[PDB]
Every structure is written in structure tokens, then in C-alpha cells.
Amino acid sequence: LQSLEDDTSINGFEHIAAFHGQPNWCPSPDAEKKFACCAHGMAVFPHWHRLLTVQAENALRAKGFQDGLPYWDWTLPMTALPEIVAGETYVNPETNLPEPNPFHHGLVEGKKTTRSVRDELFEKPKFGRLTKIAEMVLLAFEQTDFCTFEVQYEIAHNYIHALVGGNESYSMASLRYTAYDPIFFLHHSNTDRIWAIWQALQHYRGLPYNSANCAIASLRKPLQPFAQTSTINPDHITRDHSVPFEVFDYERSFQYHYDDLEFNGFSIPQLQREILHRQHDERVFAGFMLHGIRKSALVTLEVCEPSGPCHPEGEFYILGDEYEIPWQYDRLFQYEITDILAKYKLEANDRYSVKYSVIDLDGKKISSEVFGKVTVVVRPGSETKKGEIDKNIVASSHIRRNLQDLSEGEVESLKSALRRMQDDGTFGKIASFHGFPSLCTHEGRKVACCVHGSAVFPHWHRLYVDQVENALLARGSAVSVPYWDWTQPIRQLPALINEASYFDSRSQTEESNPFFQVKILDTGKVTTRDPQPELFNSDYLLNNVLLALEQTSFCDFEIQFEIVHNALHSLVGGRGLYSLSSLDYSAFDPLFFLHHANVDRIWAIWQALQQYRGLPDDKSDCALNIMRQPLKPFNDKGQNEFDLTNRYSRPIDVFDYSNHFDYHYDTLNFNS
Amino acid sequence: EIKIRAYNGSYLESSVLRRPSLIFVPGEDNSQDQTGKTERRLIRKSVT
Amino acid sequence: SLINKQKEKSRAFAGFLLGGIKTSAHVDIKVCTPEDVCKDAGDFDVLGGTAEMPWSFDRLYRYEITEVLEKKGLSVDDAFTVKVELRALNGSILSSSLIPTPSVLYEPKSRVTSIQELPPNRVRHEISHLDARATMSLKAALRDLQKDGTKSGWQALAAFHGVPALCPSPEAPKYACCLHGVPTFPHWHRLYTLQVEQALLKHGSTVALPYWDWTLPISQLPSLFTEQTFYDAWKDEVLENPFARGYIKESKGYTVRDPQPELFKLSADGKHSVLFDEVLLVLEQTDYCDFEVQFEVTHNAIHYLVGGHQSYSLSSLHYSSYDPIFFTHHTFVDKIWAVWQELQKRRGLPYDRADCAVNYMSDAMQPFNSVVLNENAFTRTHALPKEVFNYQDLNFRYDDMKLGGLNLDELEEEIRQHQSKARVFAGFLLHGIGTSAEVRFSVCQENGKCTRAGAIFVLGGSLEMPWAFDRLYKYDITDTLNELHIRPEDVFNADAPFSLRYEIIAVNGTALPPSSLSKPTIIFKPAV
Amino acid sequence: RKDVDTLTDEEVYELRQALSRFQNDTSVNGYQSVAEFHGLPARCPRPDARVRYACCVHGMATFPHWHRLFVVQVEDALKSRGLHFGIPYWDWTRPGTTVPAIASKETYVDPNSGSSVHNPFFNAPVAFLGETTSRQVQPELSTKPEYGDHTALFDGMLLALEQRDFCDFEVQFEVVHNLPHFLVGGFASYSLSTLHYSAFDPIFILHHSNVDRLWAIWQALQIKRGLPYKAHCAHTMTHELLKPFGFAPPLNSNEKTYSHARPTNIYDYEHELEYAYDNLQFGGMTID
Ligand SMILES: *[C@@H]1O[C@H](CO)[C@@H](O[C@@H]2O[C@H](CO)[C@@H](O[C@@H]3O[C@H](CO)[C@@H](O)[C@H](O)[C@@H]3O)[C@H](O)[C@H]2NC(C)=O)[C@H](O)[C@H]1NC(C)=O
Ligand SMILES: *[C@@H]1O[C@H](CO)[C@@H](O[C@@H]2O[C@H](CO)[C@@H](O[C@@H]3O[C@H](CO)[C@@H](O)[C@H](O)[C@@H]3O)[C@H](O)[C@H]2NC(C)=O)[C@H](O)[C@H]1NC(C)=O
Ligand SMILES: *[C@@H]1O[C@H](CO)[C@@H](O[C@@H]2O[C@H](CO)[C@@H](O[C@@H]3O[C@H](CO)[C@@H](O)[C@H](O)[C@@H]3O)[C@H](O)[C@H]2NC(C)=O)[C@H](O)[C@H]1NC(C)=O
Numbered sequence A: 001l002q003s004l005e006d007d008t009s010i011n012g013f014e015h016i017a018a019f020h021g022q023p024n025w026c027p028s029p030d031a032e033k034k035f036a037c038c039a040h041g042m043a044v045f046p047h048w049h050r051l052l053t054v055q056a057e058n059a060l061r062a063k064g065f066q067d068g069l070p071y072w073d074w075t076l077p078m079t080a081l082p083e084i085v086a087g088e089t090y091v092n093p094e095t096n097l098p099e100p101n102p103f104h105h106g107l108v109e110g111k112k113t114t115r116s117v118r119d120e121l122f123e124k125p126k127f128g129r130l131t132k133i134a135e136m137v138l139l140a141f142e143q144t145d146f147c148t149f150e151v152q153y154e155i156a157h158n159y160i161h162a163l164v165g166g167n168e169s170y171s172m173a174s175l176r177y178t179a180y181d182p183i184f185f186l187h188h189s190n191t192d193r194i195w196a197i198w199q200a201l202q203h204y205r206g207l208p209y210n211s212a213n214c215a216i217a218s219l220r221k222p223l224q225p226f227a228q229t230s231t232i233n234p235d236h237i238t239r240d241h242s243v244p245f246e247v248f249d250y251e252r253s254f255q256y257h258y259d260d261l262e263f264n265g266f267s268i269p270q271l272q273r274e275i276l277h278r279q280h281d282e283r284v285f286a287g288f289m290l291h292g293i294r295k296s297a298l299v300t301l302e303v304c305e306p307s308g309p310c311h312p313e314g315e316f317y318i319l320g321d322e323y324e325i326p327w328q329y330d331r332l333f334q335y336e337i338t339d340i341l342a343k344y345k346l347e348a349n350d351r352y353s354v355k356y357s358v359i360d361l362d363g364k365k366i367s368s369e370v371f372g373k374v375t376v377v378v379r380p381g382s383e384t385k386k387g388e389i390d391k392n393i394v395a396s397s398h399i400r401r402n403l404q405d406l407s408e409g410e411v412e413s414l415k416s417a418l419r420r421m422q423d424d425g426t427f428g429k430i431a432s433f434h435g436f437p438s439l440c441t442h443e444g445r446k447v448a449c450c451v452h453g454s455a456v457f458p459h460w461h462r463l464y465v466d467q468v469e470n471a472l473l474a475r476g477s478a479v480s481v482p483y484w485d486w487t488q489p490i491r492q493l494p495a496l497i498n499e500a501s502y503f504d505s506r507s508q509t510e511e512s513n514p515f516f517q518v519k520i521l522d523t524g525k526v527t528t529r530d531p532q533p534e535l536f537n538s539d540y541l542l543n544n545v546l547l548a549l550e551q552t553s554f555c556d557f558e559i560q561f562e563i564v565h566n567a568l569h570s571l572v573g574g575r576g577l578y579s580l581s582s583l584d585y586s587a588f589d590p591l592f593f594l595h596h597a598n599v600d601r602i603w604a605i606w607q608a609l610q611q612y613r614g615l616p617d618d619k620s621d622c623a624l625n626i627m628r629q630p631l632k633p634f635n636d637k638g639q640n641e642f643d644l645t646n647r648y649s650r651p652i653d654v655f656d657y658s659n660h661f662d663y664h665y666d667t668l669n670f671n672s
Numbered sequence B: 001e002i003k004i005r006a007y008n009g010s011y012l013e014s015s016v017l018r019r020p021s022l023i024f025v026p027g028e029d030n031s032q033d034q035t036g037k038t039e040r041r042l043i044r045k046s047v048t
Numbered sequence C: 001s002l003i004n005k006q007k008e009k010s011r012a013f014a015g016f017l018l019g020g021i022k023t024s025a026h027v028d029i030k031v032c033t034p035e036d037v038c039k040d041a042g043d044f045d046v047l048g049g050t051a052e053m054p055w056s057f058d059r060l061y062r063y064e065i066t067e068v069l070e071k072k073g074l075s076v077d078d079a080f081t082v083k084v085e086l087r088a089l090n091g092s093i094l095s096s097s098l099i100p101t102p103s104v105l106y107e108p109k110s111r112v113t114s115i116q117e118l119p120p121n122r123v124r125h126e127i128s129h130l131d132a133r134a135t136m137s138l139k140a141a142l143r144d145l146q147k148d149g150t151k152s153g154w155q156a157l158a159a160f161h162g163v164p165a166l167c168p169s170p171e172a173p174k175y176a177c178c179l180h181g182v183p184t185f186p187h188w189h190r191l192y193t194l195q196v197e198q199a200l201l202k203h204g205s206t207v208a209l210p211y212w213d214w215t216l217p218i219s220q221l222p223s224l225f226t227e228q229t230f231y232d233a234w235k236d237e238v239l240e241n242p243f244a245r246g247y248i249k250e251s252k253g254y255t256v257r258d259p260q261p262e263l264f265k266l267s268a269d270g271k272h273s274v275l276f277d278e279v280l281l282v283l284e285q286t287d288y289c290d291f292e293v294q295f296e297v298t299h300n301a302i303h304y305l306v307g308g309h310q311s312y313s314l315s316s317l318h319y320s321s322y323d324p325i326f327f328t329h330h331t332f333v334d335k336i337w338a339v340w341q342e343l344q345k346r347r348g349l350p351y352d353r354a355d356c357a358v359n360y361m362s363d364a365m366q367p368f369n370s371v372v373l374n375e376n377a378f379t380r381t382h383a384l385p386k387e388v389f390n391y392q393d394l395n396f397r398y399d400d401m402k403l404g405g406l407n408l409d410e411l412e413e414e415i416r417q418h419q420s421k422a423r424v425f426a427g428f429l430l431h432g433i434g435t436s437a438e439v440r441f442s443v444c445q446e447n448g449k450c451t452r453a454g455a456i457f458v459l460g461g462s463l464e465m466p467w468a469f470d471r472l473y474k475y476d477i478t479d480t481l482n483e484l485h486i487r488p489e490d491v492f493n494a495d496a497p498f499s500l501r502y503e504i505i506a507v508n509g510t511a512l513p514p515s516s517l518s519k520p521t522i523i524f525k526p527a528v
Numbered sequence D: 001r002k003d004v005d006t007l008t009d010e011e012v013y014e015l016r017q018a019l020s021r022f023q024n025d026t027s028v029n030g031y032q033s034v035a036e037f038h039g040l041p042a043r044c045p046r047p048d049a050r051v052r053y054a055c056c057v058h059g060m061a062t063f064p065h066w067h068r069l070f071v072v073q074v075e076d077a078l079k080s081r082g083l084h085f086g087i088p089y090w091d092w093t094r095p096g097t098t099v100p101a102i103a104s105k106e107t108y109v110d111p112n113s114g115s116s117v118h119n120p121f122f123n124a125p126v127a128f129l130g131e132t133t134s135r136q137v138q139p140e141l142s143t144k145p146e147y148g149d150h151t152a153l154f155d156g157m158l159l160a161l162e163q164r165d166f167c168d169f170e171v172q173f174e175v176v177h178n179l180p181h182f183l184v185g186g187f188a189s190y191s192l193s194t195l196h197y198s199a200f201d202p203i204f205i206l207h208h209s210n211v212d213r214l215w216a217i218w219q220a221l222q223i224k225r226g227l228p229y230k231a232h233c234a235h236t237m238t239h240e241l242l243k244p245f246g247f248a249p250p251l252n253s254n255e256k257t258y259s260h261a262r263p264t265n266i267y268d269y270e271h272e273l274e275y276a277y278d279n280l281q282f283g284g285m286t287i288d
């Protein structure tokens, strides 16, 4: 770069950069009025900047180089600007002397580039969530059309210019002196990488990428000045590839490509899953129309409540000067409000207004009525939208499987983990919820908070079983909790629970499997099973669950659900006072979990049937005076562990288990 | 006739629970029920 | 039918279990806020005595509760309490524990479609089906109001849409009250169209304003307007038809209609007008905002087709309300809007709400919001376009939702047919330029010798708000490319396929600079 | 899989949680029971007979195959607990290399609970002996190569790659592989300095992941040059069952390695070993 910038002729860095500004040969050099070919807001902007980067790389290759231009990753959070450009004078021991950096500033027509960094770049994002720039660029990927992609792409692109330039004319903040600072090349390379991510994801989706179908009329036009004869640009490959139908297949054309397509440590399928999970729920947008105002300036937004004050909602930035073609975006431009909506807990359809204020770089307030009536729109979630074709979603973390086919390794692992849980003894404390002791109070008397006989019954058991299995996986079991199927006729008791005792190779010794019995804490006794002689070779459970599943509404379903739930409980409890019969103690056995797992399974099955039938499924129609209040044991914080048990405790929240709890099943088949 | 079977080994009299009933539902074979057309005839009435 | 209509709205109900308490008492329900504010929603009585045989219902008992909650703002998905008070016959308070605590139930929408019955008036028949009785009744019942110079006069009525302006404030007239561009256009115009039926009925109407199917092949303007003067001898005075001209209490002039040659152009089969394909294209899409932006220019066309080149005609928004053809056409406009809902019902996508205009829906609705400008008490409380979608609540209907003398079945069949193959579209930007204009475009390939691709329409007066449409208005040129013998793949081909030459013609014959409007774009639509 | 120099906070946090979950387990698939595969007590070749040995193939024609199977087994065990991606690898070949600061500490604060917690990377407990591995430091790894030169490890790697057949490349590969073992082990009794307790320190998996990466770039370079990279001089050595990975369940709970105990289908790691690498970069200079 030292040699290239010292060069002055048609091979000069100065000329290759002055391409992007003055002097002007745009639209054609032979015109009484000349502008710049920095196509801002057009539909060929990515094409043009890709050509610029290719020309820059070809030009620099001729000065003893090997690879392409490294891309500065401003998406990933940082605390300081890159040290490759931070220095002004650095010491090279090859000559054993210091000399000035070629990145700190750039001398152009008797003046140098100037930098004025602002602290708002150096924000430290709170743990777990990305930064503002990251989410802005992220929301440009789900849109399956380059037509709508381009606007978010360019707005993210030009955010950095105001973010880092400052308020100096002799700087890259303004378009006039922005192609002369060296880091501009780096930034545009990174933006080209963002676009490459875009078409990679497009190919993953399967829709065509190398042939957009929105602006073919303009896309037919060759670009300038990248198409005039070599007398104006020394190289030839860009001039020959001027027509922009071919700057898509970069790897086939220009013989170069990136290596790390990952974005903040996200693989392509991983970020696809993440964006689908984000799209799952409903949200809100602010919508703008954009046109030049001849002065690049920031635009801030604030929502004013008619029944209250007005509050700011962040800001974005736009580019514009007096030496470019006027541009008009075809469609709306989106901005996010969801964070402030959550913060102010205002209803999704309340009365309010959104007001935009335009401020120049200096700080002067231009008239706040230069963009018409800014709109606000609402977008329903993927769950809310229906396609009547299955569900077609894949989750992560927990995957619950039918233990009848579970292999012995994880079986031994999980029984060992449960034994360790009994060892530490917190299992009794966590299971004390469902019955005795009195962890509950009512009518001025020690009682149990065992929710029973209401629409919130399946909710409470699903939450309880998931909390218990999370506490178990805290011991690092090989697999998550399994479910014992009973829809198929049972030949006998399941092997894992009826086998006398296990033999572990860790000690190469026998030991009794806990699944038989467990000592109830400080009671002087232990549990005991008692099978019933009519539990086998019957289709009664099958036909009963079918005639319970046939129903349509929810409240009716709840009652037959509870009936069949307590059915096999009483059947297997037997004469034993301390068994699966009496619910005061019946939750102390692992059979409780092995049963409630399929108890949840059938609810999920009914959910799938309702989804297929198109009737309302997530929303309920009973206990509406209660469905807002979360479950009593899980309302508190001391007893409940963390996370789901204290945030996603709303019965209204409970329905969206596949997303707000992240656990799928092995399959939704129901007895073949 | 209804009897109560308990885990203790005993019974309970049926009077503790309300006496149940029998319900029969026809099949869902129904296709059309609404009349093809009504009758548009005027009817006069006394003024009082 | 009344109870079927009642079932459409959702209901909130209090559910109870009842039994015999061998006595009689008065029961009162009490709905209470979390902060201990209680309201007496209702009451009834329970009957029994010492000699009765004990009983209890096998099911629920429902009591309607929506009134108090909707009056006090407590929505259905809120939290509250319900309490029961018992008063004995002998003046003794009774224990509430004797009854079980009640529950709350929610009966939802009933998305089924109901064929409502209404009296044989306020039923907008098709214009050609009108008989002599209906025609004479309408013309008399319209001239009667037209010859009225009072506050309810026709000029004062039509002053809303046109001029003199009374907006944004009646005290100081700045600009016209016509609402255009923004999505609430069909709402405003449909309610304005309805507004005249009240006046017509109260002045002696017999049927509502008919709709004219201009989509059918049109030889010329229908004979109802084409007529000039007829004699009936009842008043022994020849009556001139009020369906040709209109008095302006300000300008002392009159409008003058003017046909245009293109209005008589017929389709390929000849059973539909040239605007039929555009009508289907409007019906095709799903999102409501895209629908309305594609749908405005549709009715905007006829104003220019029939208004001619006159400052005082339908070609100008200032004085378009002073000609009954305005009402005649907006009737068919509302027809299109209504028939869109039946097509919506197929995929059941939400339509009553506007996901893309949540700020716009709840906007105060000018000018009917203020009682100063109009004194129709029925519409004095309808300043919300959200309560206008369910037009059955507005007490009218249509004879049939048929278009082009055809059923929605063949409509969806033709939509599928036109979706089967590929398509090429022209997308135009459009925004207010404070006049009315023609956009005539010609598709021309490399040769430079080409045909007339087509034209579109735009209107705007000089006393209206600035406005820009949200999205790109799309027009079909695939057939024209077919006569040009250029396959759609040629557009993608590395060969230079073609371009378009557009131009704009003003109403008075002048031509505005092409710079006043953006650059049109070419869109491609694949096969499905 | 990615190098440990491009991992942010949250991935480290999730990995630490997963490691602790693995560690406190005392199962057949426990961390100690899988470190058993590479050290004492001895159960090789046939645990039923009298002879005692360690199945860790050292200095023979199957070292890369065996250790790659080991690392993929560890990956399969770990990814169940919630590992989003592959195991990170530490690039000791980096000029001016240092101990990974991700592991060099001892305790760290969980921000979610805002509280201190013991870092699993610091040390692990030997189960039967009841002791723990203690690392040791030496300045040899942390020496600074001068301006424009190359470090000893780097030139060792080059002098390992210039050869053009697998049948001898492995000997220098192994002899340079053993160096960072002692370099990180030092003179401490329990460390990677000896194979007696080699697997009881997490850095082991990082080091051998780097090993597998170098073997992969060896294949890439060889296929670029157009030479047979298959270990054809071990035709009677590959076909041996790589015990204990070829035994019967439940001794080998995982099934993928058991089915792939034949090394003849392990060269194409992009397909039948369900893992891949982000970049083939070596010292800022690619295979081309
Ligand atoms: C005024 O009217 C009320 C309602 O009819 C009368 O309340 C009734 O009072 C009698 C005795 O005060 C209750 O009899 C009770 O019967 C139970 C068995 O069911 C028995 O165990 C008690 O010892 C007692 O005898 C009766 O239940 C109650 N009515 C109801 C519906 O509960 C009241 O007595 C009337 N006033 C006068 C002065 O009679
Ligand atoms: C025929 O219609 C055209 C428009 O469709 C009329 O042109 C409009 O009015 C004037 C020309 O009469 C022009 O703009 C005006 O320019 C004056 C110059 O001082 C300015 O003061 C006004 O404020 C206004 O901007 C222009 O051609 C056009 N106005 C626009 C586009 O805003 C034309 O006048 C009509 N013909 C006749 C005979 O009136
Ligand atoms: C693997 O198992 C070990 C048990 O040997 C876990 O260590 C212990 O984990 C529990 C969390 O379940 C820690 O309890 C917490 O301690 C903090 C600090 O006192 C306290 O503020 C919390 O309220 C909670 O009680 C416990 O302290 C910890 N053991 C020690 C010695 O600190 C380890 O977390 C497990 N690894 C996992 C689950 O990944």
C-alpha cells in the first residue's frame, strides 16, 4: 500500500479511490452536469461495490502480495479499533527504525484524512444477546428477496461512516472524503462478505440467487465508469465483467473466496435455526420512506404516548450530499421497536404516535416533517400463521425417547445419576411439592398445592416434570428423561423398572437398582409397588385415550385427560398405602416421572391434532380468571431453581413448549 | 347400579356421589339439515 | 337469522352449577376488581321448598356478563373475582358457600358466512335489472333532494368530498376533506357512499343506489343517464333527467361528461372489458395494504375515462362529487371490496384487522367525527374505520357477490389459470403531483419500432395533502410481449431484450416533464 | 471445529458448564471411565487374560487413526450434553505461543448468578488414586521468536511435511508430537509429561485435535500434489481391531466408532466421521 499510494498515475491508489467521488465522469464524462457513480439506494449498489473491491485487489496484487484484502469484522463486538490502523508511526526492525504508518491518515489534494471516533462504538453488549449493529444486520437475512435485503444491507453499511467519522468535513463521515481513508476498502470487503453470507443462505434455502427478479430493467444497464476503455482504468477483467449479471458467481468468475462464513460463532444452519426461533413470536416494526436531503444526517425516533410523555428509541443514519444521483427506495424501510415495547410494557395495539427528528452531523435540527407520515406495523409469529402441513420444526438440547429401545449404556448412566440424586437428598426436597409435607397453605390449614381438577392441571404437571428432569440433567445423565409407553399392550412390567438389581462395571459389582423403592425422608418407611392382575392384555387404555382425543374443545379434553391419568395410577398403586395410589405420597417414585412423561406426550399429540384441524389450540377457553396468574409453587423464587421456573411460569406461556422450553420428542407417532 | 371400590379394601355407599344417568348420542353421519327454502307469506293481525 | 347474527360476536359468560336448597332466595352476582371495586352485574332467583325432591343440573348454567366488563374496560383476558350473594325470603342473609364458586367461559367468533335477509330496499341491484317503476322512483326521489337548498341540500352534502373545502378545520378552510392515498381510502369512500342513503330514504327513496358493472362489455353510457327529458303529465310538466348534469351553487356552471374511445375496447373473447384482467389482478393478492395500493388506480381509471378534458367534470377531484356517476361507480367499488372478503375466507387470513396500518385504523375519522359538518345521528358515532368492515352492521347488503355475471368459483379458477404460467410485470412508482395525468408506456425492443403497451391513470386536485403510495403499482404486459413475440426468458437472456418508453399527458393536453415521476421497473413472476 | 483464539465469552461459558456436567458424572460413560482408555489401570489387549498393557498405539502405523477415533468418541459423548459445535483446538504451532488463558486460570465468576465458581480446566480429580493432575510451566513454549525467523516447533512441522509418503512421515510426526506433552507436563508427577496419567488433563483433547488437523492438512497437500496418501505399507496393520474401540457393549456404549473400527473408511473425515474444519490455514499461508 505504501507503493500504491506513492504512485500517482492511472495505476495510482489516488486515482482508483477518486473513482468514488470527484472528479466526475458520471453518468458520462461528456455531460454539462456531472455526478458521482456511487449508486446509493439503487438496486446495483452491491454489484458496484463488489467491482470496486475486485479492482482494488487486482491493483494491489501488482505490488508484491499474496492474498486478498483482510476484512475488518465490525459486526463482532470490540473495545478498540484494530491495531493494524491504530498506530501512526511504527518501528520496523527490518530497517531498525520507526517510520509513519500507511493506515493512520491519507494525504489527498493537499490535505489528509482525519479520524474522530465516538464512544458509542465501544459499547459492551450485555451477556447473551448481540449488539445493535449485529441485530440490524441479522434482521436482513430472513427476508427471502434481495429486493428487500438491499435496504437493510446499505443502512447497516452506512451506519459505520457516521459512527466512526465524527463531525469533520475532512473525514470519511461525508461521502466526499470517504474513499481516501484506507480502512474504507477493508469495510467494503467486509460488506461484500455479508452479501456472500446472504447468497450462501439463499442457496441453502434453494431459491435462485444469481438471478434476481426485481430490477432487471436497471440491472441490464452496464456500470460506469467500470466500462469505458482502458484509457480510464488500467485493468481489463472488471471492464469485461462490467455487465452485472455475472458478478454473482464470484468463485467461478474472479477466482477468490472467503474462508470463515461464520457470524459471531454461528454456522449457517445454526443461524438459520436461530432466526426461525426469533421469527416464531409476534413483533412490531416502524416503517420509513427515504429520499435524499443533500446532507447526510442521523434520524432519531421517539414514541409519544397521548396518555403520557415521549421516549426515545435509538437512531440510525443515512448518507447524502449534493453530488449524487437522486434516489428513491422502492419500498418501506424497517426499524425495531420490540425492545422499547417490552421495556414500557405497553400493549401491542395501544394508542401512541411515533415522531422522527432529523439531525445533521453538527447537531442542528432540520425540520422534522421531511419524510411524510411514518408508519407502524405489526407482524404475527410463525406459530400464529398456519399452513396446515404438519409442523416441520427441529429443536435442540433435550430429546425425549421411548425407553423400551434405550440401550444399556445410557440406562446405567441415568440410573447412576438418579442414585447420586438420592445420595445428595435434594430429590426429596424437589419432589415434596406434589404432596406431603405441607409445602402449601389454604383455608388457614397446612395443605398441598397439588393442582388438580382444572384446566391448569396439565400445565402444572408439565412444568413440574420438566423442572425435575432439568435438575436430574444437572447430574449429567447421558440422555434426558424417557417416557414409558402404555398404548401398546404391556406384556409385563418394563425391564428398566422391574429388573431386580444392576451390575456396574465401574466397581465390577452388583447393586440394587433404585427404581424399585426409595426411603421417604424422615418417615421411618419406604415405598412399595403392587401390580394389579388386570393391567395386562387389554385395549381399555387404548380405546379410552382415543375417545378422549376425539374431542375438539379444551375444557372437555382436560377432564378425560385427568381421568385416564389417575386410572393407571390407581391400577398400579394397589393395596399399598404408600404407593402410586394415594397422591399425598405417590410422587416419590420414579414411576411418577416415567408416567407423567407420556402424560405430557398425549397432550402434545392433542396439540398436533388441533393444529391440523385448524381450531384454536394455544389459547384456552376456561379459567380465564386464572390463566394469567402463574402456578403457585413456581411463582416464588427461593424454592424454584432458576430461569424457566421463575420466568416462563405463565399458563399462557406453557402452551409454546417446543420454543419457550426447547424439548422435542423422538416422534409424534401414536401406536404405529 | 353403582358401587365404590376402595384401596383400603372396603366399599362406600353410592349416596356420597350424585346418581349418574345414561346418555345416547347419534352418529355424525348427518350431512344436510337446513331447509332448502322458507315460506314468504304475509299474515295480517288485528290493530289491538 | 337474528340469533345467527348475534352468535357472530364473541361472548363472555359466567358458568354456574345449580341444585335444590329446599327454599327460595334471590341470588345476586358481583364482579370485583383486584383492588376491591365491586359491581352488581345481575341477579335472578332460585326456587324450592322443604317438600321438594332434591335435584341438580347435569350441566352448566350460563349468564351473560360481557356488558359490565366491556363498559368498565376489564378485558376478557384480565384477572378479577366473582362473588355470589343470597337473600332469603324471610329477610335472612344466606351463606355463599351453599353454591359452588362459578367459572368464566369464552365463546369465540363464528367465521361461517351467513346469507342475511333484509327488506327489498337497501339492496343495491345491478343497474340494468332496474324496471320502469324503480327508475322513475329513483329519479323523482333524487330530483326532490336536488332541488333543496337547505343545509341538507345536495350541494352541501357533496361539499364533503369536493369543494368548497372545510378541512383540516371547519373554522379555517385550508384543504379539501377528501382522504386519498393512505389505506383508509375505501373506508372513507364506502361510508360516504352509504351516507347519502339516509338522506334519500328520509326524502322519499325507494331503492338504494344501483351498481353499474362497467367490467361487462359497454356499448356506451347506459340509457338511464343517456336520457334527457320525459313526460308523465302527473304535474303536467316535462321532467328533465337529473342524471346528466348538476348545479354548482358556487360557480353557477355545470359539469359536462365526455366519453373516450378506449372505454369501448373489448377483451379477446369480447365478454369482458379491458379492465377485467386488472380487476382479477387486484383480487389476486392477499395482504390488505398491497391490495389497496393495487386497487386505488382501478377506480381512479373511470374518472379519467368519462370525465374527458374538462375542468368541470369527473376528471378533477375538486368537482367530481357533483355528478351522480361518481356515486354509481363507487357503489361498484364497494362491491369489489366486499367480494374480496369471500376470496379472503378461503385461506382465512386475518382481514378485519389491518396489520399494516395499526396507527391509521384508530385515527380520528374526518369529517364525520365532528357534529358540526353533518347531523346524521346514526353516523355521528362511526369515526372508526375498524367498525366498518362488518358492513352487515351498517344495515345493507348486495343482491349477489357475482362479478362479470359470474361466480367466485370461476373467479378462482381463472386466478389459478393466470397463475399457472410465468408472468412479466411493470412496476411504477406513483405519488401526488397536484393534477391529473395519463401515463402512456410503450414496450420497445432493440429495433426501436414498437407497439403501444398500454396506459394507466392518476388523479389529484390542488387542495389535497401530499401523499406517496407505500409500494409499487404493478401492471401486466405479458400479453403485449406475446404479440411482440418476445418470450419471457428473453428478458433474462444476455441479449438486450427490450426497454420501455413512458410519457405523461396532462388533462388539458399539456405534457409534464418525465422527471416528475420515477423510473419504471420490470418485474418477473415465476410459475407456481 | 475452530481454534481457541476465535471463541468469545458465551461459548467458553457453555463449554465449561458441559465439562462440569461431564466431570461430576460417575457413569460408564463418565469422564474418568473414558480417560481409562488411555492409561492405567491396564486392560489391553484382552482384559480377561493375564497380560496388562495400555492400548494407546505409540510409534506404529496406526497412531493418527487411533487418536482420531478417540477424539471423535469424546466429541460424541460431549455433544449430547449440549455442545452446539465441535471441540476447539489449541494451536501450539503459533509463533510466540503461550498456555491457553482459557484454561490457565483456576476460578471464574458466572455472571448469570453473579458468583464465583471453580473452573474445571484448572484440574481434574483422579478417581481411584484420589489425587489430581497438576500442570507445570516452562519458558520454552513462551519464548519469543525473533523478527522474521521461525520457531523450533514450526520448522519441525515443516521438516515433518516435506516427505511424500505416509509410511515414514508418522515417525517424525510422533517425535515432534511428544514434545509439547513434556513441555506442558514439566517435572510434576501427575501431568501430561507421562502416559501414566495422560488423559486426566483436559488439554489432551485440544492437543490431539490439533494433531488431527495437521494430519488432515497432510492429506490435503498430498492430494494437491497427486500421490497416494493411503497408508499402504500397513495393509496388514490397519485391519487389526483397534481395541478397546472394537469390543462389545456395554464396554463401548457409542456405536459409530464401533462400526468404524475398521480404519479403511476413516480417511474421508468430511463424510463418515460427522465433523469438519473451518479453515485449512497454517501460519497465515494456505495450501495453494
Ligand atoms: C328463614 O329462612 C331460612 C331459609 O329457608 C331458614 O334457614 C333454615 O334454618 C334452619 C334452622 O335454623 C336450618 O335447619 C338446619 O338443618 C340442618 C340439616 O339440613 C340441621 O343439621 C341443622 O341443625 C338445622 O336444623 C335450615 O337448613 C335453614 N335453611 C337452609 C336452606 O339452609 C330460617 O330458619 C328461616 N327463619 C326462621 C325463623 O325459621
Ligand atoms: C394544464 O395542466 C398543467 C398541469 O397538469 C398546468 O401546469 C401547472 O401549472 C403551472 C403552469 O400553468 C406550472 O406550475 C406553476 O408554475 C408557476 C410559475 O410561477 C408557479 O408560480 C406555480 O406555483 C406552479 O408551480 C406547471 O406547468 C404545473 N404545475 C405543477 C406541475 O405543479 C397548466 O397550467 C394547465 N394549463 C393551463 C392553461 O392552465
Ligand atoms: C457437578 O456436580 C458438582 C457437585 O459435586 C457441582 O458442584 C456444586 O454445584 C452446586 C450447584 O448445584 C453448587 O451449589 C451452589 O453453590 C453456590 C455457592 O455456595 C450457592 O450460591 C448456590 O445457591 C448453590 O447452592 C455447589 O456449590 C457446587 N459445589 C461446590 C463445592 O461449590 C457442579 O456444579 C456440577 N457441575 C455441573 C452441574 O455442571
Ligand SMILES: *[C@@H]1O[C@H](CO)[C@@H](O[C@@H]2O[C@H](CO)[C@@H](O)[C@H](O)[C@H]2NC(C)=O)[C@H](O)[C@H]1NC(C)=O
Pocket: B006, B008, B009, B010
Ligand atoms: C377405608 O379407608 C378409609 C380411608 O382412611 C378409612 O376411613 C377412615 O377410617 C378412620 C379410622 O378407621 C376414621 O377415623 C375416618 O373417619 C375414616 N374416614 C373415612 C372417609 O371413611 C377406613 O377405615 C377404611 N376401611 C376400613 C375397613 O378400615
